[PDB]
Structures are given as structure tokens and as C-alpha cells.
Amino acid sequence: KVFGRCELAAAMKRHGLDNYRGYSLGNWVCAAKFESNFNTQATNRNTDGSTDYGILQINSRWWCNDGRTPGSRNLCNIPCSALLSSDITASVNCAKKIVSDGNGMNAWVAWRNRCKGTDVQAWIRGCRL
Ligand SMILES: CC(=O)N[C@@H]1[C@@H](O)[C@H](O[C@@H]2O[C@@H]([C@H](O)CO)[C@H](O)[C@H]2O)[C@@H](CO)O[C@@H]1O
Ligand SMILES: [Cl-]
Ligand SMILES: [Cl-]
Ligand SMILES: [Cl-]
Ligand SMILES: [Cl-]
Ligand SMILES: [Cl-]
Ligand SMILES: [Cl-]
Structure with a gap:
């Protein structure tokens, strides 16, 4: 599913x-x-063999199981495929754990490089929240 901007804002807020x-x-x-262009089905392969999944590009190195990332963890206790669902519940619940891990949103490379310090309120401008 490719979310609209305000559509995703509403879903994230409810969760x-x-x-x-x-x-x-x-x-x-x-x-x-910037992680997924709002596409729940986004995947990307990392240099080390792990893969990033879903709307927030959550990495199998630490957070989910895909059965093809040797030595990795599954800290969200979920199959990585669950992070590709049209329903964002699993991605949100895992994101909550990630952002609580010590380094806040810096865990998201695209957030650090493209969002951090910018006028992020622009992203929810005009949305009915
Ligand atoms: C929270 C989360 O999963 N963020 C991912 C990043 O982990 C991922 O960055 C890759 O992670 C490194 C190793 O794969 C794991 O130590 C790679 O060196 C780094 O590129 C990023 C990739 O675009 O996506 C999310 O931000
Ligand atoms: Cl947009
Ligand atoms: Cl694995
Ligand atoms: Cl699994
Ligand atoms: Cl949803
Ligand atoms: Cl980036
Ligand atoms: Cl904001």
C-alpha cells in the first residue's frame, strides 16, 4: 500500500x-x-546481507526475522514480512521499541540525514488531526 501523507499521519497517530x-x-x-516513500511493501538489501522492510525500513540485523540474516537478532519478535502489511500496526509497535533503544530516531538513517533539524511540521500541514 502506498499511503497518502495525511493518511499515514492519521494512522500513525491512532497507533x-x-x-x-x-x-x-x-x-x-x-x-x-524518505525511508520508503510511504510504500508499505518497500524492501532494501544492506551490504552486510540484512534487509530493511516496510514503511519505516526496519532492519533484519536487529529487529525482525527473515531467516536469511545469519547472526542477527529479532528484537521485535516478528517475521520481517509482517512489516510489509498494508496495516501499519507491526511497523509501529516495532518502531516504538527501536526509538526506545537509546539513540532515539537516529536509528533511521534517512531521518538523521533528511529530517533531523528541519521543519518537520510541514509533513502534517493541512492534515485533519
Ligand atoms: C531502524 C532501522 O532499522 N533503520 C534502518 C537502518 O538500519 C539501515 O542502515 C543500514 O544498517 C547498517 C547495517 O545493515 C546494520 O548494522 C548498514 O550499514 C546501514 O546502511 C537503513 C538503510 O537505508 O535503513 C533504516 O534507516
Ligand atoms: Cl508527499
Ligand atoms: Cl536470520
Ligand atoms: Cl519468524
Ligand atoms: Cl494502518
Ligand atoms: Cl539518507
Ligand atoms: Cl510535527
Whole structure:
């Protein structure tokens, strides 16, 4: 599923991501924009053999099981395929664990490089929230 900008903002808010760990909704929407372009089915292969899955490009190195990342962890206790669903529940629940791990949203490369410090409220501008 390719979410609209305001559509994703509403879904993230319902699942309690807004202001989660102090990160405003615009931060989360911006992260999803640059990680996946709002596409729940996005996947990308990393140099080490791990893969990033879904709207927030969550990495199998630490967070989910795909059966093809030797030595990796599954800290969200989920199959990576669950992060590709049209329903964002699994991705949100895992994102909550990730952002609580110590380094906040810096875990998302695209957030650090393209969202951090910018006018992130622009991403929820005009949305009915
Ligand atoms: C929270 C999350 O999963 N973020 C991922 C990044 O982990 C991922 O960055 C890759 O992770 C490194 C190793 O694969 C794991 O140590 C790679 O060196 C690095 O490229 C990023 C890739 O675009 O996507 C999300 O931000
Ligand atoms: Cl957009
Ligand atoms: Cl915001
Ligand atoms: Cl594995
Ligand atoms: Cl599994
Ligand atoms: Cl949803
Ligand atoms: Cl980047």
C-alpha cells in the first residue's frame, strides 16, 4: 500500500506514535517519506546481507526475522514480512521499541540525514488531526 501523507499521519497517530519518546508526528511522517516513500511493501538489501522492510525500513540485523540474516537478532519478535502489511500496526509497535533503544530516531538513517533539524511540521500541514 502506498499511503497518502495525511493518511499515514492519521494512522500513525491512532497507533500512538505522535510524540512517542518526544518525537512529534511530523518526524515520523518525514522518516517514512524518505525511508520508503510511504510504500508499505518497500524492501532494501544492506551490504552486510540484512534487509530493511516496510514503511519505516526496519532492519533484519536487529529487529525482525527473515531467516536469511545469519547472526542477527529479532528484537521485535516478528517475521520481517509482517512489516510489509498494508496495516501499519507491526511497523509501529516495532518502531516504538527501536526509538526506545537509546539513540532515539537516529536509528533511521534517512531521518538523521533528511529530517533531523528541519521543519518537520510541514509533513502534517493541512492534515485533519
Ligand atoms: C531502524 C532501522 O532499522 N533503520 C534502518 C537502518 O538500519 C539501515 O542502515 C543500514 O544498517 C547498517 C547495517 O545493515 C546494520 O548494522 C548498514 O550499514 C546501514 O546502511 C537503513 C538503510 O537505508 O535503513 C533504516 O534507516
Ligand atoms: Cl508527499
Ligand atoms: Cl510535527
Ligand atoms: Cl536470520
Ligand atoms: Cl519468524
Ligand atoms: Cl494502518
Ligand atoms: Cl539518507
